[PDB]
Design a protein around this nucleic acid. Structure first.
Ligand SMILES: [Zn+2]
Ligand SMILES: [Zn+2]
Ligand SMILES: [Zn+2]
Ligand SMILES: [Zn+2]
Ligand SMILES: [Zn+2]
Ligand SMILES: [Zn+2]
Ligand SMILES: [Zn+2]
Ligand SMILES: [Zn+2]
Lengths: 298, 309
DNA sequence: GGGCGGCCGCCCT
DNA sequence: GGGCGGCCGCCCT
């Protein structure tokens, strides 16, 4: 049970836990209205609120022995933990806490290896998920290896096998920091791989680069129109390596703006010029703030 | 805005079809126009369903043209479109041919038709291609609780108005409703409120539509036909033999019930009459209100519930 | 931060 | 010498 005014750890839609205080409780919207340290406020599902630890029973069996984590010091039966403990040990939510982080989870060290193992087993059933038509969201708001909430159009990767979406912070295969709504990847999660993830960058067209970066600027700054040269092209150049342009990567910095501007002008159904609202014609924005769709998907 | 009173326009009705009409009133707040049609009938039509009319690109109103984004002229309405301005994009293959090209507007106009859109022909082939791309955003749609109506009144491949219970199919995937006139998978004209189908639209299938007829029980046959009679004639009670059974026999082929289809005409009334008397929850005899016993009506004027596949 | 009242100034046959 | 492409920037749907 929870109670108003209680200090808790709440998992956000980026897979990470944040310290907060329960202000309100909704009995079965199944959420708590939580204020965070930056005085930001939001509703959080109970499955994402953190107060045997899985069985509430004291008996240490054999070979179902009670194992105590060596960091948080909480106990787990060998067959109650997810995954099960056979044979220094850390539990799942301590493994995730010390490994998952913005930009991508840790790749090296004992904790990172413990994550790689435990990631292969989901804390939920794939059958109990109810997806929308485009397989972007599910009713349970249950995604990734962690089982937390998530927004597909932000920094998440969809597995091309199980079609589940996975947080940037929870994957360990990223060479560069993820861009918002970047779907130009072939990704296979650790569950489907039964081991380390597979990640391959799909080739980008100039219209893809323009769309993806305009989308990122739009998300970051919460605005629509951007100067094609001084804002958009600047962001593209500053993130050129992060973009993995593929075979377009050798394009001289002087020649990049030509192709980008051409894409902005040609694709009228995708990009709005400032001239349409009596502003600078070099100002461009997305008609609909939606991530670019790679050739394969929808 | 674009419109003024006395202007002759093409107005899209809730069947997905355009009709010739004249604007009598304009409502800025409702974004609609009061339109009189050729049958002198009058109704309010949303601006999104009004077609003004009947070398510059009609979409962006610019006149530049160069490969691989050239200006393509519609071989019917004569209007020009950039390859990347049209929805969907015009493939460069089109320009590399002697064959005609119609725009999305003209493609729909020449193919969509009462009882079901054209199945064969170059135009029919173009419809099945173009309608895989919606002219609207599904995310902008604000649906009601039962997912029957949205406040935008935007449905189907066409983006026009519609009544789900009046000749429309719901896709089992995207849950959007599609006009009878806009689909190319029907074998027979639809009955009102007939949801005994498994339908997958071209948008979800990325190709031809999928359609399978779900089986009807005798209670479903009576319910569906009672519902149709109630909607058409705007009343509740009908004569089981002279009115209901007459409708059922006249629409027996169009009903396509499945395993019960081979039932002899003379035998059908036996099972229909029993269904009316057995399903007390759905069917209401006239005796319950001190009227003739063989009069029957639906307690709730709603379509029958289709079975899970 | 973008919708629109406002008008600069190029350049029109 | 005036019509319109172009967009500044005021100020709050
Ligand atoms: Zn995660
Ligand atoms: Zn236990
Ligand atoms: Zn622990
Ligand atoms: Zn997977
Ligand atoms: Zn339609
Ligand atoms: Zn155009
Ligand atoms: Zn046309
Ligand atoms: Zn569909």
């Amino acid at each position: 049970k929870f109670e108003e005014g209680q200090d808790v750890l709440a998992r956000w839609s980026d897979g990470l836990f944040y310290l907060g205080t329960i202000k309100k409780i909704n009995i079965l919207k199944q959420s708590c209205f939580i204020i965070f340290e930056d005085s930001s406020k939001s509703w959080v599902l109970w499955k994402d609120i953190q107060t045997c630890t899985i069985c509430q029973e004291e008996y240490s069996e054999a070979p179902n022995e009670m194992v105590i984590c060596d960091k948080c010091g909480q106990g787990y039966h060998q067959l109650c933990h997810t995954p099960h403990i056979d044979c220094k040990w850390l539990c799942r939510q301590c493994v995730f806490a010390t490994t998952t982080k913005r930009g991508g989870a840790l790749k090296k060290g004992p904790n990172a290896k413990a994550l790689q193992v435990m990631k292969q087993t989901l804390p939920y059933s794939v059958a109990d998920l109810e997806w929308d038509a485009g397989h972007k969201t599910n009713v349970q708001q249950c995604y990734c290896y962690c089982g937390g909430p998530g927004d597909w159009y932000l920094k998440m990767l969809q597995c091309c096998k199980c079609k589940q979406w996975f947080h940037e912070a929870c994957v360990q295969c990223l060479q560069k920091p993820m861009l918002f709504g970047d779907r130009f990847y072939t990704f296979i999660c650790s569950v489907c791989s039964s081991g380390p993830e597979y990640l391959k960058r799909l080739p980008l067209q100039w219209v893809d680069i323009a769309h993806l970066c305009l989308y990122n600027l739009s998300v970051i700054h919460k605005k629509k129109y951007f100067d094609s040269e001084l804002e958009l092209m600047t962001y593209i150049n500053e993130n050129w390596d992060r973009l993995h342009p593929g075979e377009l990567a050798d394009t001289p910095k002087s020649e990049r703006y030509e192709h980008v501007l051409e894409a902005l002008n040609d694709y009228k159904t995708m990009f709005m010029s400032g001239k349409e609202i009596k502003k600078k014609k070099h100002l461009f924005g997305l008609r609909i703030r939606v991530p670019p769709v790679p050739p394969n998907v929808a």
